[PDB]
């Protein structure tokens, strides 16, 4: 179920939204210019702050933006609950992590971020 | 196998590169020289320090430099949680098979 919240629905954050939007789009809006400087896209994003200040709201906005971008050209955004991947068997959790990352890198391409 | 890494990429770590050369590269380059002085080659090298200080960088650099230095070498990378299986079996079988293959490649003559 694609969320229906966009960047226009978030207020009071004209800087953090700008930073995450840059880190998500700029490496893929201008691939050749990034390659000219040999600057790779960032691979680690962390969001922290007091409870109920808009972190999940920004996550939903990013998901909606990715959905719109892909529809312009659905399964690229992967949502994982915190302890969801945890399993009682000893080796199942590591195998699940590896399978998730392998599937994510399977669909990864230069023009399509995952 | 990870190519395209060398000591030239790593900067600011001069003594440690020399030590890792002495412990690893030197026994392979010189064996009769070690046997003349009855000096047993060091078998195990551990790398420790603050996170992100370049342990994996030095590892891949030495892995490539061993191949480039000799005038066919095999580098094996295995992680901890990789060799864990939910079944009662294969928890130890995989490790024993890996070491048997390492011994086989050593018998072939290629350093492992």
């Amino acid at each position: 179920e694609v969320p229906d919240v966009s960047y226009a629905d978030i207020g009071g954050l004209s800087r953090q939204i700008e930073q995450i939007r840059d880190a998500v789009e700029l490496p893929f809006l201008h691939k050749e210019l990034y390659r000219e400087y040999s600057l790779r896209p960032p691979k680690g994003v962390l969001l922290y702050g007091p409870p109920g200040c808009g972190k999940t709201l920004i996550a939903k906005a990013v998901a909606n933006s990715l959905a719109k971008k892909m529809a312009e050209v659905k399964s690229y955004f992967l949502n994982i609950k915190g302890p969801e991947l945890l399993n009682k068997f000893v080796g199942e959790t590591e195998r699940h992590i590896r399978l998730i990352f392998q599937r994510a890198r399977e669909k990864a391409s230069e023009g399509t971020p995952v | 196998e990870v190519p395209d890494v060398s000591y030239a990429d790593i900067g600011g770590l001069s003594r440690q590169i020399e030590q890792i050369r002495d412990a690893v590269e030197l026994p392979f380059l010189h064996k009769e020289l070690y046997r003349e002085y009855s000096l047993r080659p060091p078998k195990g090298v551990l790398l420790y320090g603050p996170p992100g200080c370049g342990k994996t960088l030095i590892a891949k650099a030495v892995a490539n430099s061993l191949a480039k230095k000799m005038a066919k070498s095999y580098f094996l990378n295995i992680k901890g949680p990789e060799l864990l299986n939910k079944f009662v079996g294969e928890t130890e079988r995989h490790i024993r098979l890996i070491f048997q293959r390492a011994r086989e490649k050593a018998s072939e003559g290629t350093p492992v």
Binding site: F89 | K86, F87, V88
Partner: peptide, 17 residues
Amino acid sequence: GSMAQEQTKRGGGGGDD
């Protein structure tokens, strides 16, 4: 000086007939 409570991790087991 503290007490702990254990959570078990089940190991796979399968038999035929």
